[PDB]
Design an enzyme around this catalytic site. Sequence first.
Site, mmCIF file in Angstrom:
data_model
loop_
_atom_site.group_PDB
_atom_site.id
_atom_site.type_symbol
_atom_site.label_atom_id
_atom_site.label_comp_id
_atom_site.label_asym_id
_atom_site.label_seq_id
_atom_site.Cartn_x
_atom_site.Cartn_y
_atom_site.Cartn_z
ATOM 1 N N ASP A 106 0.825 -1.204 0.000
ATOM 2 C CA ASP A 106 0.000 0.000 0.000
ATOM 3 C C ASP A 106 0.875 1.277 0.000
ATOM 4 O O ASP A 106 0.627 2.231 0.748
ATOM 5 C CB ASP A 106 -0.928 0.005 1.200
ATOM 6 C CG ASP A 106 -1.986 1.136 1.143
ATOM 7 O OD1 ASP A 106 -2.280 1.649 0.032
ATOM 8 O OD2 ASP A 106 -2.530 1.461 2.246
ATOM 9 N N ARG A 150 0.346 9.218 0.389
ATOM 10 C CA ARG A 150 -0.366 9.403 1.632
ATOM 11 C C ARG A 150 0.318 8.548 2.747
ATOM 12 O O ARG A 150 0.141 8.819 3.943
ATOM 13 C CB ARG A 150 -1.845 9.012 1.471
ATOM 14 C CG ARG A 150 -2.046 7.530 1.121
ATOM 15 C CD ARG A 150 -3.556 7.182 0.921
ATOM 16 N NE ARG A 150 -3.618 5.791 0.494
ATOM 17 C CZ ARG A 150 -3.534 5.402 -0.776
ATOM 18 N NH1 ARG A 150 -3.587 6.298 -1.750
ATOM 19 N NH2 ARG A 150 -3.489 4.106 -1.079
ATOM 20 N N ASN A 151 1.051 7.520 2.323
ATOM 21 C CA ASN A 151 1.733 6.616 3.254
ATOM 22 C C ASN A 151 3.235 6.878 3.300
ATOM 23 O O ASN A 151 4.018 5.968 3.581
ATOM 24 C CB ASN A 151 1.406 5.135 2.958
ATOM 25 C CG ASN A 151 0.020 4.784 3.436
ATOM 26 O OD1 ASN A 151 -0.486 5.449 4.370
ATOM 27 N ND2 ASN A 151 -0.618 3.765 2.816
ATOM 28 N N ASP A 182 2.836 2.516 7.496
ATOM 29 C CA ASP A 182 1.816 1.510 7.268
ATOM 30 C C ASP A 182 2.341 0.225 6.649
ATOM 31 O O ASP A 182 1.560 -0.574 6.138
ATOM 32 C CB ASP A 182 0.668 2.106 6.413
ATOM 33 C CG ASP A 182 -0.253 2.989 7.254
ATOM 34 O OD1 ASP A 182 -0.298 2.788 8.501
ATOM 35 O OD2 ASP A 182 -0.915 3.878 6.688
HETATM 36 N N1 LIG Z 1 2.437 8.534 12.723
HETATM 37 C C1 LIG Z 1 1.574 9.431 12.246
HETATM 38 N N2 LIG Z 1 1.727 10.720 12.615
HETATM 39 C C2 LIG Z 1 0.869 11.630 12.134
HETATM 40 N N3 LIG Z 1 -0.173 11.445 11.310
HETATM 41 C C3 LIG Z 1 -0.315 10.161 10.994
HETATM 42 C C4 LIG Z 1 0.493 9.113 11.399
HETATM 43 N N4 LIG Z 1 0.063 7.923 10.849
HETATM 44 C C5 LIG Z 1 -0.968 8.274 10.100
HETATM 45 N N5 LIG Z 1 -1.255 9.603 10.151
HETATM 46 C C6 LIG Z 1 -2.360 10.280 9.476
HETATM 47 O O1 LIG Z 1 -3.546 9.708 9.959
HETATM 48 C C7 LIG Z 1 -4.560 9.752 8.909
HETATM 49 C C8 LIG Z 1 -5.164 8.382 8.760
HETATM 50 O O2 LIG Z 1 -4.165 7.501 8.168
HETATM 51 P P1 LIG Z 1 -4.569 6.100 7.582
HETATM 52 O O3 LIG Z 1 -5.578 5.464 8.381
HETATM 53 O O4 LIG Z 1 -3.320 5.229 7.343
HETATM 54 O O5 LIG Z 1 -5.206 6.487 6.152
HETATM 55 P P2 LIG Z 1 -4.513 6.776 4.787
HETATM 56 O O6 LIG Z 1 -3.028 6.884 4.975
HETATM 57 O O7 LIG Z 1 -5.072 8.090 4.274
HETATM 58 N N6 LIG Z 1 -4.918 5.572 3.703
HETATM 59 P P3 LIG Z 1 -4.318 4.002 3.808
HETATM 60 O O8 LIG Z 1 -3.007 4.023 4.771
HETATM 61 O O9 LIG Z 1 -3.907 3.584 2.345
HETATM 62 O O10 LIG Z 1 -5.282 3.066 4.439
HETATM 63 C C9 LIG Z 1 -3.870 10.309 7.678
HETATM 64 O O11 LIG Z 1 -4.095 11.712 7.624
HETATM 65 C C10 LIG Z 1 -2.401 10.023 7.976
HETATM 66 O O12 LIG Z 1 -1.481 10.865 7.323
HETATM 67 MG MG LIG Z 2 -1.942 5.327 5.852
#
Ligand SMILES: Nc1ncnc2c1ncn2[C@@H]1O[C@H](COP(=O)(O)OP(=O)(O)NP(=O)(O)O)[C@@H](O)[C@H]1O
Ligand SMILES: [Mg+2]
Length: 300
Positions: free
Chosen positions: A133, A137-138, A151
């Site tokens: 993935d 965004r990751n 992730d």
């Molecule tokens: N360690 C972190 N510190 C700060 N923000 C974070 C962190 N991990 C995730 N986020 C943010 O949390 C939100 C949710 O992330 P997430 O659930 O992984 O969804 P996603 O990255 O948008 N899609 P996906 O990972 O492909 O399922 C997003 O805005 C991320 O950038």
């Molecule tokens: Mg993510």
Amino acid sequence: NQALLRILKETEFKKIKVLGSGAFGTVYKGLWIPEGEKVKIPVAIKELREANKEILDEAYVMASVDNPHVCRLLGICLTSTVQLITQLMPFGCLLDYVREHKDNIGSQYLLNWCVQIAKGMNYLEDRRLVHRDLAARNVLVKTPQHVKITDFGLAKLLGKVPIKWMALESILHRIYTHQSDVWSYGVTVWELMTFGSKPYDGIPASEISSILEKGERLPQPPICTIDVYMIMRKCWMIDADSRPKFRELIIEFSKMARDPQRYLVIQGDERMHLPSPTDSNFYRALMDEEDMDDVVDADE
Ligand SMILES: Nc1ncnc2c1ncn2[C@@H]1O[C@H](COP(=O)(O)OP(=O)(O)NP(=O)(O)O)[C@@H](O)[C@H]1O
Ligand SMILES: [Mg+2]
């Protein structure tokens, strides 16, 4: 190793604010309150949507990832839900970062981020680990000069599919390999070089395998020269073994970073250099004490 994964009790931490959610769970800014202390330490907590032996087995692998360009799993709490604890990154994800800075990002940063993401994925490939993935965004921003893939392990742990990042063989057959991660890497690079455009915007996910089978691909970003776009296109070959290797991508993008204005054309680039040693040192002292390779600077 047992020592790399902290088992947390629910009393040791608290979720404070939802940061967002995606395909596998929801992320919160949280506080770790170490027992007997009075300090409140910010963390990120991801609670998964929707076994324990299998979950912990995968968590130990995630906690073993020790590389400056990949986020490590630090702790886990198993209750009715699975909650994953990691370092909180105040700068957020790189997709949002390039969107928000669409007018102040130079070639040196873009090309170095491509090097860093390739280094992190190459570390995973060397460990025989597949991400499944990867996308902008990751990738999380630790400092503007230092990014990290996040992730890892989540797709395997729980596997809307991110069709528009997926290699054709993943879409058609749910086959995931290092070379399908390379396809996703190429999409990620396209997201960076477009300052966060949505891939295949307006096209339904259900049409994408048909488009790819016809030979259609994401368009050349206006800042990219033909050598950079050819790398992207090579990442999206139907034949997975025809795609670049991550170790090749480290070499190529590092070469490009040594002559950045030869490979990307960006308005005002001459005003957009890497930070001075003074500013770099200050960032590292406040936010980023971990070991990392030097950024690739321009020869000129
Ligand atoms: N360690 C972190 N510190 C700060 N923000 C974070 C962190 N991990 C995730 N986020 C943010 O949390 C939100 C949710 O992330 P997430 O659930 O992984 O969804 P996603 O990255 O948008 N899609 P996906 O990972 O492909 O399922 C997003 O805005 C991320 O950038
Ligand atoms: Mg993510």
